[PDB]
Amino acid sequence: TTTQNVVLTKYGFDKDVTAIDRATDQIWTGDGAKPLQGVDFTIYNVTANYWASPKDYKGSFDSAPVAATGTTNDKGQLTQALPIQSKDASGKTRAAVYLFHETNPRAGYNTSADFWLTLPAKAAADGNVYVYPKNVQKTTYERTFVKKDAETKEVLEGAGFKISNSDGKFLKLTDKDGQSVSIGEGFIDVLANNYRLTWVAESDATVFTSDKSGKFGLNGFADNTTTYTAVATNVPDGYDAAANTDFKADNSSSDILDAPSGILP
C-alpha cells in the first residue's frame, strides 16, 4: 500500500560554485540558484538488482523495471509517489530501492550522476523526501551578426541565412526531444528555450533572419574553435547577396554587408 513522495529539485549554479549536499529531510530553496525546467529523469526500481547482493550493488539498473518518468517543471521539480516496499528477484518483499537516471539535461548543463536510495527515507516535516541532484553548468558560446546596407550602413531587416560546417552540413534547431521548431527573426536564445543544434542537409536547415535591428544569431554552441559559414539564402529585393561569412562561436558581433544592386542607364 504505502508510498513516500520523492520531490526532486534541479538547480543550476554558476560554474565555479559547488552546492553543499542536502539531506532528504531538508527543504532547500536554492539560495537564488536558477531552477532548471525541462530535464528528464527515469526512475528505475532496482530492488531486485540490489537485493541479489547488497554489498556488491554499484548502481546497475540493467533489466530493472521503470518505476516512473518525469520532467522538471518551471520550479525545477518533479514529484513522484514511490512504494516503500517492493519484491526482489525471488518474490520476497524487501525495502524498495530506486535509482534516478537523468536522460536529458538542460541545454548548457552537464548531466548529473546516477543516484539511488532505499525507502523509507528520512522525510522533512511535511512528509516528503527531498533530493537535489547536481547539474554543473558548462560554458557555451554564442554569435551575433548585424545585416547592413553596404552603402547607407543602416541595418537591414528580413535577410535570410543558413549555417554550414566543414562537412557541408547545415544547422537545424530542434526542441529537447529532437522535433522541429518554428524560428523567427533575430537572435535565437537556444539556452532559454532548451533547443538543440543539429547538422543536416541544406534543404532541412534552419533559416535565420535579420530582425528590425538587423540582428540575427544564436547561443548554445559547444566550442569556440570550429569554423562555420553564414550563407545568404534570402536576399532583400534591390540588394546583391552578401558574400559567405566564415566565423567562430566566439561571443562576438560583426556586420554582414549587402550591396544595393546597381542599375545602369
Side-chain angles (χ1 to χ4, degrees), residues 127-142:
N128 302 324
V129 175
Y130 292 85
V131 292
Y132 304 97
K134 277 171 188 50
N135 290 292
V136 180
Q137 189 172 13
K138 55 174 152 177
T139 53
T140 63
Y141 303 98
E142 69 187 61

Side-chain angles (χ1 to χ4, degrees), residues 163-171 198-202 205 228-229:
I163 296 171
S164 87
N165 65 18
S166 69
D167 290 340
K169 297 272 238 182
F170 291 80
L171 181 53
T198 62
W199 296 101
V200 302
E202 190 178 344
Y228 308 93
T229 313

Side-chain angles (χ1 to χ4, degrees), residues 6 14 22 43 51 64 73 76 79 82 94 98 112 122 139 153 174 176 207 230 239:
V6 179
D14 302 3
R22 264 91 181 177
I43 304 173
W51 286 103
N73 65 15
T79 291
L82 297 172
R94 302 292 192 176
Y98 296 101
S112 63
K122 194 189 204 191
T139 53
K153 301 308 198 316
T174 78
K176 48 167 285 203
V207 177
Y239 293 87

Side-chain angles (χ1 to χ4, degrees), residues 18 33 74 83 106 118 120 122 126 140 181 207 235 242:
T18 309
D74 285 350
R106 206 181 160 79
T118 61
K122 194 189 204 191
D126 63 4
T140 63
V181 285
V207 177
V235 184

